[PDB]
Amino acid sequence: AGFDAEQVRDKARKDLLHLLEGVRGKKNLVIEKDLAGPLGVIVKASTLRDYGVDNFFFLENKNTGTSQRNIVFIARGESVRNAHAIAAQIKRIQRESQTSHDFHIFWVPRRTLFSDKVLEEAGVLGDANISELPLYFFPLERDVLSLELNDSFRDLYLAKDPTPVFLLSRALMGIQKKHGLFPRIIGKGENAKRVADLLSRMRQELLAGEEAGESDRAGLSPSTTIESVIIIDREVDFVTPLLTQLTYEGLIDEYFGIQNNQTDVDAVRKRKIQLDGSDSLYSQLRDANFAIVGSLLNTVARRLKSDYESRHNTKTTAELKEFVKKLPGYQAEQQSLKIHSNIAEEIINYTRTEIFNKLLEVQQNLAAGADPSSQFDSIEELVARDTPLPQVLRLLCLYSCISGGIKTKELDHFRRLVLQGYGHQHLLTLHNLERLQMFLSKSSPLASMITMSGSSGGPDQKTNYTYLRKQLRLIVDEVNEQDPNDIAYVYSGYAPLSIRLVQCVLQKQYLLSITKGGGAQGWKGFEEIVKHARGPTFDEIQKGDKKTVFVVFVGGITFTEIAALRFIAKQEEARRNIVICTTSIINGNRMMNAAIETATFEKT
């Protein structure tokens, strides 16, 4: 009777297809590109053709074919560009046509007033059968739900757009509507609180309806199959995604970039690799520290080879007749192992370069607590060797975020290095990093960390990583990577603060043990510590056996954080079912790409 991620997939598929029925006859499909990916997780492209789709077209290509008569658009409705893009296309076929065509548009997840005004001041609003496609969480795994909002980080922290926060609230509210109110809403961070606030405002709006005869029968009471929801704001811990991830899936995302459980590679244009928990090999590989991937890859090749040789024993029909049956299951494992070898082998040559080791050296030194000034010459050498701008910016932001701002003298040298190394166009890139508050001067009030010494002052004072490093045992130089005993294995000695904060709630006994159920839940006993992380700390209460726990990340989560979280899910397998929710899957490069100006002072 509890929560199951598959019912999300099923509803998603059923709602889409039910709208395809609504459009009678065969149809040609037009999809927003960064929506096509996520869609492939809930529905087969096979299944779509059967429901009458002839050809597939990307919306941003402006090349919709006149093949079939019915043209169907599927795009996210919150997007200002998407509205214009479709509207432009509806004219690129009313003045180049051969027939009139009927136009259907499926807004995800809703039709917005803005969408209409853009469509209206082009006249094409009237010839449009507009329906809503309530997609929110895309179930990427059994324990991972993601809104798959790729620009959500830019939108939220730069553009100051409440849309991702809004959607996530709606998404979570959907969970409540089906399985009951979250008994507790525990969280940390400004946008985490915003999500909680939207969850209480939306709850009341459902009661204003039912009281005033809008009916809906009922009528939400506290759940019995959900323990709580824990909401973490990404802007509370920018450091973890900035660090170069050192798990297998992390490094794949760090180097190849993973989108919608997929990615592109060249060694058997390029080809699309599927990366999800289906592949039995990848399941075990993905969450492991990259060091032991060789050892793990070999052990499986060493075991596969002595499983092919095996069972030539009873050489009479049967024991061979039974062997050829289990034969396609060998070839798959054989082709999987070659892929995840080639990939591993390629990630290896990358980690052996002098630049990479120089990067890791600076990242590790800064995270460990070394004097950041000691990493200056190293950063300068990296700029001089023309290392990719994102990697350098990640260091500077890591530098800035971990030292409570940057010293005035060192700041000006850093700005000179970036500008004279990559382009004066990046006067804008640095300005964006300043608004994101990840590259600031020490003399800025926004750069200050939280201290119980420097009086009050500062409304939005930053996470004190220096304090939190000690108080929360952020550094574990122990941890063996062959058989991890702490989440700090995902960075080879560094435990992510974000997940460590989750442990302040979920694993109080363990967290106390390394610093020398029923209750008491909440932040109880870790109030002074969590006080030193950015933003509001909260724990609202809404009014038998194992229940599910939703760990929600507002503003992106990393593969390192997912693995670490999965590591905890196992340790808690007895009393809890942990389900991860997030606006998107984020990383250092996606974060930086949000701030980086691509214009160029060159020839047009």
Partner: protein
């Protein structure tokens, strides 16, 4: 004294605007988190108010200004701008950096170095009043104007692409092409750090 129990904090806003209670309507749309409700109040207010009064309302409230500002950089969508609106918004708010960045962003769209430097000049013109605090950005702008000139010079003399490259990138191409006399001029001119120049110089010769 009572916007009270009723109703759904979600359409007490059109009610609020019907009663010409400006800003209160806006605040309720912001509190709602609903970006659709927020745009709605913003679009109505724009049609209703002199822009200056509109600018004052939306600048007191970060989320509102943020959305006005976004839409100003996305009216096509993407690429094309409503640059006039932005300049006025930043001027009436003393957002001198944000206003300067608009001209800079425009310099990046200029097909010629002469026009791009002209936009860069405007960027600077906003910044000379103050002066302090903008010391770095004024300097950066002045640097960009110089490098652009020197690079078109290189383009004319040596007959190869140079305009648009970074300082470091310019030395590299100059060294890789054997023009050490010019590459040392760049270094001395833009005070390129020793460790950087030695590093550049090394990488170039092997290519």
């Amino acid at each position: 004294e009572l916007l009270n129990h009723e109703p759904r904090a979600g359409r007490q806003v059109p009610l609020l605007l019907s009663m010409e209670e400006d800003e209160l309507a806006l605040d309720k749309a912001i509190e709602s988190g609903d970006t659709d409700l927020i745009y709605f109040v913003i679009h109505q207010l724009r049609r209703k108010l002199p822009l200056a009064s509109f600018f004052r309302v939306v600048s007191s409230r970060p989320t509102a200004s943020a959305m006005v500002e976004a839409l100003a950089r996305n009216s096509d969508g993407d690429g094309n701008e409503d640059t006039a609106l932005l300049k006025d918004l930043y001027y009436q708010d003393d957002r001198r950096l944000d206003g300067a960045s608009v001209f800079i962003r425009e310099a990046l769209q200029q097909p010629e170095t002469r026009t791009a430097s002209d936009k860069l000049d405007l960027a600077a013109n906003l910044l000379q009043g103050n002066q302090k605090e903008h010391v770095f950005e004024l300097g950066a702008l002045k640097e960009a104007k110089m490098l652009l000139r020197m690079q078109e010079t290189f383009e004319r003399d040596l007959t190869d692409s140079f305009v648009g490259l970074s300082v470091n990138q310019t030395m590299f191409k100059l060294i890789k092409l054997g023009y050490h006399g010019r590459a040392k001029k760049i270094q001395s001119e833009f005070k390129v750090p020793e460790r950087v120049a030695w590093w550049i110089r090394l990488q170039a010769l092997v290519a």
